[PDB]
């Protein structure tokens, strides 16, 4: 099978350069341990979507503001399957600031691939908001094998 991604979201209080690499790296930190492939399409979204919205987007799944669900992407599949949801009213920040655009992008992208919602406590896959140094920003814990093997 073939895989494809497409990003198109830019929130305030954060340079477009941070978000660009934030998500762009999310595909690497994940693909680092996955049989999947790589296909950066310039035009033509695919099973994997990425868009930021504020609460109820007319016909979407509203979440909340700063504090609640900063971003939660449902499992993969058709259409919605593999869609990213980033709270607009939220407060995005660098790898140091609270809402880690990088780490978050990896957590949301994971749920829209084949991740549960916990795996391990130390792992960065846990359902929580934490900021880690981009220098060491990378997959860890046993989860690293739960993505490459994909069993349960
Ligand atoms: Co989550």
UniProtKB/Swiss-Prot annotation:
Ca(2+) 3 binds at residues 64-65, 67, 69, 87, 90. Induction: By exposure to bacterial lipopolysaccharides (LPS). Inhibited by dexamethasone. Zn(2+) 1 binds at residues 57, 59, 72, 85. Ca(2+) 2 binds at residues 47, 79, 81, 83. Ca(2+) 1 binds at residues 13, 88, 90. Zn(2+) 2 binds at residues 107, 111, 117. It is found in: Secreted, Extracellular space, Extracellular matrix. The active site is at residue 108. Found in alveolar macrophages but not in peripheral blood monocytes. May be involved in tissue injury and remodeling. Has significant elastolytic activity. Can accept large and small amino acids at the P1' site, but has a preference for leucine. Aromatic or hydrophobic residues are preferred at the P1 site, with small hydrophobic residues (preferably alanine) occupying P3. The conserved cysteine present in the cysteine-switch motif binds the catalytic zinc ion, thus inhibiting the enzyme. The dissociation of the cysteine from the zinc ion upon the activation-peptide release activates the enzyme. Belongs to the peptidase M10A family. This is Macrophage metalloelastase. It comes from Homo sapiens. The chain holds residues 112 to 263 of 470 of the full protein.
């Amino acid at each position: 099978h073939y895989i494809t991604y497409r990003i198109n979201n830019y929130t305030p209080d954060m340079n477009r350069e941070d978000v660009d690499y934030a998500i762009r790296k999310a595909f690497q930190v994940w693909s680092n341990v996955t049989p999947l492939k790589f296909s950066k399409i310039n035009t033509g979204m695919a099973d994997i979507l990425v868009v930021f919205a504020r609460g109820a987007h007319g016909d979407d799944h509203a979440f909340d503001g700063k504090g609640g669900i900063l971003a939660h992407a449902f499992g993969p599949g058709s259409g919605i399957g593999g869609d990213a949801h980033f709270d607009e009213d939220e407060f995005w920040t660098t790898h140091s600031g609270g809402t880690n655009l990088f780490l978050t992008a990896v957590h949301e992208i994971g749920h829209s691939l084949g991740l549960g919602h916990s795996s391990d406590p130390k792992a960065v896959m846990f359902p929580t908001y934490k900021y880690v140094d981009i220098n060491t920003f990378r997959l860890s814990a046993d989860d690293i094998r739960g993505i490459q093997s994909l069993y349960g």
